[PDB]
Design a protein around this ligand. Structure first.
Ligand SMILES: CC(=O)O[C@H]1C(=O)[C@@]2(C)[C@H]([C@H](OC(=O)c3ccccc3)[C@]3(O)C[C@H](OC(=O)[C@H](O)[C@@H](NC(=O)c4ccccc4)c4ccccc4)C(C)=C1C3(C)C)[C@]1(OC(C)=O)CO[C@@H]1C[C@@H]2O
Ligand SMILES: Nc1nc2c(ncn2[C@@H]2O[C@H](COP(=O)(O)OP(=O)(O)OP(=O)(O)O)[C@@H](O)[C@H]2O)c(=O)[nH]1
Ligand SMILES: Nc1nc2c(ncn2[C@@H]2O[C@H](COP(=O)(O)OP(=O)(O)O)[C@@H](O)[C@H]2O)c(=O)[nH]1
Ligand SMILES: [Mg+2]
Lengths: 430, 426
């Protein structure tokens, strides 16, 4: 009961997955061979077979072999079922249309057959946790092919989606704006709560809080997994105020399309800093309202908040939480909408945050993940549609998308649908 | 899994090719016999990208060797790695191309292409999933320029959706060994602009400038030039042979690199490069790897990128390095040099990062630049062609092979059309 099917797509989604499953195995005490030495706390994330082997409720999908062949060879080769690590032959080439129309069109009915064989083991499936890059060809095009199928096949089930989204300055591709804009139909129509994350924001969090001068991606993926462990903690553990995955959405989402919250986590801190400050509930609550800790490069003070889910975990008590959010309501720099006088959903879970033993991040008695619907996020969209406009005015790479079976008009129809989302997040702030 | 078929044409193409096979055999840990002797499982994981597995655990490279003379086959077969190639894949004539493009394309190689193409089929049918063709040749002389572009045309017609990826050594005014290179090159660029998906434009004048003003070689040979070319050939395919933090297939390069279909003529480069007497004083770190990689002195075509703007650059890094540090440096470069990148593309740099640096390096970068300055290479070839053609000089050697003055007029027309398209975006 309370199962989640976790679907990891492209290189970004698979490598965040290889950090998520590194965490969940430590947090439930499962060995990297899937065995458990010595309560059903693992049941959300792992199916148990009669040998005493816990097999993860996850699908890994990539259109090329390289990243999943590394999962099939590294320390987790014995964790996963061998046919739910799914590879094609041909890379999607950072082209949405290869992911959606031409290459991913061959693998999709093998991917959905594995998701069906997972869902048939779930006794009370709670939702999908979908992990991807907005800038990738597999990330945008295959996730958008998959979600369209899952939204007719599992129409009632909540689809939570964790997206690495293009930055203000940092970028890895020229066509990252095209793939991201083409994805905006997926998140609007075939998703229920979409967590945008930014590489440049997490790099700055790493520089300021973790004292690490030059991080890899493995440093980011240990922060993106710490957030999903904190979202799902109420599904897995005992708490004072456990939050259901639909209870979460009923407080986060004010209007059907207004489901793009920010997320942040506290305390992100180096183990050397964590001795010289006390890290009380009020300190870590106030840390979530700093622009310095937001994992998208936009300023929350240029918006209004609509709703917050303060998802506390570890040694946290409801007294201290009420006393903390009363100070957040006292501060005039943190502005809410006139129509949400309540503001805060609170969750409080008794399980401390798990340290990954190779990690940059301290042992702490308390953490909070704050997931936060705010008008400010529209600036991250108003950044990227201005990158799209400069290139699409020249038609600057469009022949590679048209050459792989896409209609040219889908670029106009995607920039149009993004302007209608960027309108809605401005329209509710009044 | 993403197989490449490699093809070598003429003296230059077989020489940069026969050095390339020594470089990628060192990477993959393959002995001059064809046997594996490497350290690591990662060397053997993607050996199929460039080799066929054969009996006794011998690995035979998926190379076709093409010439109109036996003497370069004899020089390769007797060479440092010559015994590794399949005897059936040496396809050759007896009488050479005479440095004549029309002997290559219409007579001497038109006879031989039926015997080449049916070997390209045996290798491509032995592939599990072919990604593309990797052809090494020169645009001066007759074999590489005229037979190699005949062969590009035949493989393009037969495999229309696979990547056609060519490494093309091409003429320059101050380092020329032949009278009719402007003719041979102009007739050859007319085939590359239509058929290839990528063409990596390389110059002996720029390869000597790296040897003299960076490596400080006192007497650089063609063997030293072939070593600079083959380092960048090994570089661009790295992400389909080794694991990485950002993987980029040759197609993931092309989609980012080629804004408009015909603007696929690239200027390659490599880092680190040092004299052997100064490797002791450098720090190989990504900022220093970057400051060399974007230096007008480091690039393997004589076009100074300060005479144009980049459309796209791709920096394919190799080694254990930070993604923040790589993303920081590729930002700092195009903001501090913003007058040298086109402002209608909002990020001009593609990055890729492989976990496995070249044997004996801690880090490497292979640079690919698509720049409006490449027009200066096609402009100077066209200006040399024009002087010879305005007086029909040497044209009885081409028209005696059944060619027309109309084909010369149409080739130089298409050359100025390629120049005009790069100049348009400058
Ligand atoms: C102790 C030390 O640092 O040795 C270096 C060295 O001194 C330098 C000068 C090397 C050296 O390069 C040359 O001597 C050279 C000469 C003419 C043309 C090109 C190179 C080196 O020979 C080259 C050699 O590189 C390799 O072995 C790579 O794996 C390379 N493959 C080959 O060079 C090779 C040679 C013979 C047979 C098979 C392969 C490679 C390059 C790209 C992609 C894959 C592989 C290296 C690191 C060194 C020496 C040995 C001195 C340099 O080359 C490379 C590619 O790193 C030239 O400038 C760099 C910087 C290095 O510091
Ligand atoms: N944090 C993090 N970001 C990543 C990681 N890998 C890739 N990214 C980001 O993903 C974006 C590019 O997406 P790709 O990695 O090319 O996505 P893909 O689905 O594999 O794309 P295709 O190769 O075309 O199929 C870039 O903005 C990267 O910064 C990772 O492991 N962690
Ligand atoms: N880098 C490199 N250039 C070469 C080599 N041999 C010849 N070249 C040069 O590039 C040109 C190549 O022409 P060539 O390959 O001889 O003509 P072909 O045999 O008829 O195709 C020559 O004029 C030389 O200047 C070599 O080994 N390496
Ligand atoms: Mg991918």
């Amino acid at each position: 009961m309370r199962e989640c099917i976790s679907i990891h797509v492209g290189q970004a989604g698979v490598q965040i997955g290889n950090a998520c499953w590194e965490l969940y195995c430590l947090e439930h005490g499962i060995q990297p061979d899937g065995q458990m030495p010595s309560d059903d706390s693992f049941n959300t994330f792992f199916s148990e077979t009669g040998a005493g082997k816990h097999v993860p409720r996850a699908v890994f999908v990539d259109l090329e072999p390289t990243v999943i062949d590394e999962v099939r060879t590294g320390t987790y080769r014995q964790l996963f079922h061998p046919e739910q690590l799914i590879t094609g032959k041909e890379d999607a080439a950072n082209n949405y249309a290869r992911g959606h129309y031409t290459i991913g069109k061959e693998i999709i009915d093998l991917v959905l057959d594995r998701i069906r064989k997972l869902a048939d083991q779930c006794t009370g499936l709670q939702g999908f946790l979908v992990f991807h890059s907005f800038g990738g060809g597999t990330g945008s095009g295959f996730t958008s092919l998959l979600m369209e199928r899952l939204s007719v096949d599992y129409g009632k089930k909540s689809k939570l989606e964790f997206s690495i989204y293009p930055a203000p300055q940092v970028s890895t591709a020229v066509v990252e704006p095209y793939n991201s804009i083409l994805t905006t139909h997926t998140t609007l129509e075939h998703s229920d709560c979409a967590f945008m994350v930014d590489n440049e924001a997490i790099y700055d969090i790493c520089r300021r809080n973790l004292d690490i001068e030059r991080p890899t991606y493995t440093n980011l993926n240990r922060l993106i997994s710490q957030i999903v462990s904190s979202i799902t903690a109420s599904l897995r553990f005992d708490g004072a105020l456990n939050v259901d995955l639909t209870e979460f959405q009923t407080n986060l989402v004010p209007y059907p399309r207004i489901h793009f919250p920010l997320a942040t986590y506290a305390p992100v801190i180096s183990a050397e800093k964590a001795y010289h400050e006390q890290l009380s509930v009020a300190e870590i609550t106030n840390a979530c309202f700093e622009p310095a800790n937001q994992m998208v490069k936009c300023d929350p003070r240029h918006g209004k908040y609509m709703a917050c889910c303060l998802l506390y975990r570890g040694d946290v008590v409801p007294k201290d939480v009420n006393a903390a959010i009363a100070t957040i309501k006292t501060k005039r720099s943190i502005q809410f909408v006139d129509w949400c006088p309540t503001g805060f959903k609170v969750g409080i879970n008794y399980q401390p945050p798990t340290v990954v033993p190779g990690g940059d991040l301290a042992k702490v008695q308390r953490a909070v993940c704050m997931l936060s619907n705010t008008t400010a996020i529209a600036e991250a969209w108003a950044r990227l549609d201005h990158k799209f406009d400069l290139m699409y005015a020249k038609r600057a790479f469009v022949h590679w998308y048209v050459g792989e079976g896409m209609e040219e008009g889908e670029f106009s129809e995607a920039r149009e649908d993004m302007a209608a989302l960027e309108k809605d997040y401005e329209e509710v702030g009044v | 899994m993403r197989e490449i078929v490699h093809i070598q044409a003429g003296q230059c193409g077989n020489q940069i090719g026969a050095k390339f096979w020594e470089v990628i055999s060192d990477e993959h840990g393959i002995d001059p016999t064809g046997s594996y002797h490497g350290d690591s499982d990662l060397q053997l994981e993607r050996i199929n990208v460039y080799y066929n597995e054969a009996a006794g655990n011998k690995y035979v490279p998926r190379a076709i060797l093409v010439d109109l003379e036996p003497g370069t086959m004899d020089s390769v077969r007797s060479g440092p790695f010559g015994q590794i190639f399949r005897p059936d894949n040496f396809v050759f004539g007896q009488s050479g191309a005479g440095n004549n493009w029309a002997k290559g394309h219409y007579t001497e190689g038109a006879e031989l292409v039926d015997s080449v193409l049916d070997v390209v089929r045996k290798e491509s049918e032995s592939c599990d999933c072919l990604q593309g063709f990797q052809l090494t040749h020169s645009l001066g002389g007759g074999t590489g320029s005229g037979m190699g572009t005949l062969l590009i045309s035949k493989i393009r017609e037969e495999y229309p959706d696979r990547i056609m990826n060519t490494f093309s050594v091409m003429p320059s005014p101050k380092v020329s060994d032949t009278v009719v290179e402007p003719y041979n090159a102009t007739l050859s660029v007319h085939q590359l602009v239509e058929n290839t998906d990528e063409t990596y434009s390389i110059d002996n004048e720029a390869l000597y400038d790296i040897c003299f003003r960076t490596l400080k070689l006192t007497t650089p040979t063609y063997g030293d030039l072939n070593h600079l070319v083959s380092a960048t050939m090994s570089g661009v395919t790295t992400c389909l042979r080794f694991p990485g933090q950002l993987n980029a297939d040759l197609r993931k390069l092309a989609v980012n690199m080629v804004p408009f279909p015909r603007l696929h003529f690239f200027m390659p480069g490599f880092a680190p490069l040092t004299s052997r007497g100064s490797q002791q004083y450098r720090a190989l770190t990504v900022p220093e790897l970057t400051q060399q990689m974007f230096d007008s002195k480091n690039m393997m075509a004589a076009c100074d990128p300060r005479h144009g703007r980049y459309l796209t650059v791709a920096a394919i890094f190799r080694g254990r390095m930070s993604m923040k540090e790589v993303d920081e440096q590729m930002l700092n470069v195009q903001n501090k040099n913003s007058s040298y990148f086109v402002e209608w593309i909002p990020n001009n740099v593609k990055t890729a990062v492989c976990d496995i640096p070249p044997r004996g390096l801690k880090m490497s970068a292979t640079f690919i630049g698509n720049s409006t300055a490449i027009q200066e290479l096609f402009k100077r070839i066209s200006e040399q062609f024009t002087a010879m053609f305005r007086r029909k000089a040497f044209l009885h050697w081409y028209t005696g092979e059944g060619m027309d003055e109309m084909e010369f007029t149409e080739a130089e027309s298409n050359m100025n059309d390629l120049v005009s398209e790069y100049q348009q975006y400058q």
